Design a protein around this nucleic acid. Structure first.
Lengths: 89, 81, 83
RNA sequence: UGAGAGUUUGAUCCUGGCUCAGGACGAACGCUGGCGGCGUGCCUAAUACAUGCAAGUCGAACGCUUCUUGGAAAGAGGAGUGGCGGACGGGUGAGUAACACGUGGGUAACCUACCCAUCAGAGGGGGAUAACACUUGGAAACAGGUGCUAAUACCGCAUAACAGUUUAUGCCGCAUGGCAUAAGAGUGAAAGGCGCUUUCGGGUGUCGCUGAUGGAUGGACCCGCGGUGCAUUAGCUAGUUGGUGAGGUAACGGCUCACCAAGGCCACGAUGCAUAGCCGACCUGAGAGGGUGAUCGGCCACACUGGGACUGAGACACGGCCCAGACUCCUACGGGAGGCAGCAGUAGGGAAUCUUCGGCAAUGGACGAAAGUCUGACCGAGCAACGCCGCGUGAGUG
RNA sequence: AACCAGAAAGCCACGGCUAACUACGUGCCAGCAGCCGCGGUAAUACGUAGGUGGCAAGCGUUGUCCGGAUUUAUUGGGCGUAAAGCGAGCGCAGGCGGUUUCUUAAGUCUGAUGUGAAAGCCCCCGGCUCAACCGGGGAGGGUCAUUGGAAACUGGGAGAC
């Protein structure tokens, strides 16, 4: 049930998130397995940083990004590269 | 208190009932086999094979794990000959 | 097989039992506060299926798997037999 | 990155004790008071708890019932079978001096629903029941009986050995053995649903269904090392220690049984008694060290007190079941119901610690094909100078 | 954008340690103190007044932990008379050991790899009008595990004096 998602780090009104691949049972800000970049919703346009290598293996080994991270991965040519390099073999 | 689990109680009750029944049947099959060799008379193989059937069916259709199944098949074949 | 276990060497204390000896390892340590080299010891328990080794003898062992209630080591070879 | 002072004497030097100047806090109380910014708030009784919420979901698995527009479909409800999740998420620190924890290693003794990948299948049959209709007993909680009905519910028949074991052949290793390929053997499985092509088409897309093997996540067991007071606490142990055999467990093993032999641990602190949950960390210090383990993260353990197991991949189960016990409540006396150490609130204790609030807009979870529903997790709002940071209660000449 | 100096300062202390002094009042009574100690008729020590000093939306008192304590002395103390050599021997266990050649490599130093969660303390950079706070990136911590070297010191082996 490994499933990469977001994690809230802001203080009181100004949030902040870092994309972090974690098990599904563990709590929101509980433990995790490892971090994969971050993303700031504040200050539109939303600024984002990734590795683009950790993800292209944590999906290959199988993981289900939730909705928001799926958007932010599509806007980064990630999903495209996966669906490209896999549905063809 | 009890809100929507009262259904779970009934489900588990019935499941336990039929499970106990089937596993009792399996035990009785094995036990009827064991006495045969000590009796030493004929009718030594048909019940043996029926016992193997019992073990396999109880393993798959019912449930033990998978492992006891192999273990029991082994200690039985060692006993048949 | 790709790695090993905690092979220790040591000398036998007492081997009254069947297929089973009692090796004692020994080593020295440093005090927490002071720097004086104290020394303490352990008493392990091995399994020799033919009662080869005898008392007051040096041997070497290897950790195997829970083989009894408190008996989990294996004998390899009597390095320096004594009499 | 290392500061000292006062006090024994008629006055002196030395040894020596007591006291003071510095920091910090989940703090309390005494006088005093405008705010903004971010934090924190039962340490005592793991005491007893009125009140409201804190876990459901699926009509695209299946048959029913009530409606709003004699046949009509749609929409609206309600109960039930069946599936998944209630073992997560939140709470508390009573127990615990041990593999419980921190750290480094082992499993040639191991399990793993949903997720991803590959291969092989998905044939053919049968008997039931809740609902519902009638009906019997009960204050109640709820128990029966009679008759009919569906399924991806259930049961047997098939075919599948890629699993296991036995043999043979070869490769290798930490004894036990591991790996490949060939054989010889007894044996086990299953479900359809929504759609497209609808010339009977019978072919298909997609979510499900069963056997096998990997990946990933998670769980279990073993071992070295390390963290506390007493020796006005010296011996402790008869399943104990070892063996043969059997039984059993995901799995090795005195885990348990029958037989055999008398072992095992202790001055390098066993046994006993007493206090404490452990760690990342915080406080202080020149530094070595000393003292604390509240907010935040990880683990372990407990659910009124003590036992037991069922369903299940996963519990001996935090709002699940059964028994015993103390307490509270209702009876028509025959009998039943109950557990805030979930979020708020109440009484009690104490020097001392708040609102019976708004909302799923974000993030996260559960179910669902999807809309969606649930979410006191959470996000925010409210109170208290409790902590830290910033700024005023004016300025020029006079 | 408008209007108003307008609604907005208390607390502890002043004999020495310690920064900051004089009147009036009481007269070993009232009372105060952390320790020295003040109070029996001219009190900088008790009480009020007026001055002064320290902090300031805070200020004081109590309780608790570390410091100063070299007062448990590893860094870092001592035993004639100040507290302190057992009344003296014999001695198992233990602690420590003459000199030299070769050897080994446990202790020792050193190299590579893994590993020491995240948030903390620290370093650089960055964002809220600055600060707390928040964000990115780096180091530190093992007495750890595996593996390669050196051979002076201590230890283990064969020797010679």
């Amino acid at each position: 049930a490994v499933k990469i998602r977001l994690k809230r780090m802001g203080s009181k009104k100004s949030p902040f998130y870092r994309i972090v691949v974690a098990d599904s049972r563990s709590p929101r800000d509980g433990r995790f397995i490892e971090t994969v970049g971050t993303y700031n919703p504040l200050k539109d346009p939303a600024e984002v940083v990734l590795k683009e290598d950790l993800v292209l293996d944590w999906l290959s080994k199988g993981a289900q990004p939730s909705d928001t991270v799926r958007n932010i991965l599509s806007k980064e040519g990630v999903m495209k590269k996966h669906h490209e390099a896999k549905n063809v073999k | 208190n009890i809100e929507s689990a009262i259904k779970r109680v009934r489900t588990s009750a019935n499941a336990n009932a039929k499970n106990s029944s089937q596993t009792n049947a399996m035990r009785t099959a094995i036990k009827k086999f064991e006495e045969a060799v000590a009796a030493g008379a004929d009718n030594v193989d048909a019940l043996y094979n029926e016992a193997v059937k019992a073990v396999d069916m109880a393993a798959t259709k019912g449930l033990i794990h998978k492992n006891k199944a192999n273990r029991d098949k082994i200690r039985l074949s060692k006993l048949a000959k | 097989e790709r790695n090993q276990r905690k092979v220790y060497q040591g000398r036998v204390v007492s081997d009254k039992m069947d297929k089973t000896i009692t090796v004692v390892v020994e080593t020295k340590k440093n005090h927490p506060i002071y720097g004086k080299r104290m020394k303490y010891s352990k008493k392990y328990k091995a399994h020799d299926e033919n009662n080869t080794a005898k008392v007051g003898d040096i041997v070497k062992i290897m950790e195997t798997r829970p083989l009894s209630a408190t008996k989990r080591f294996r004998l390899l070879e009597v390095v320096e037999e004594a009499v």
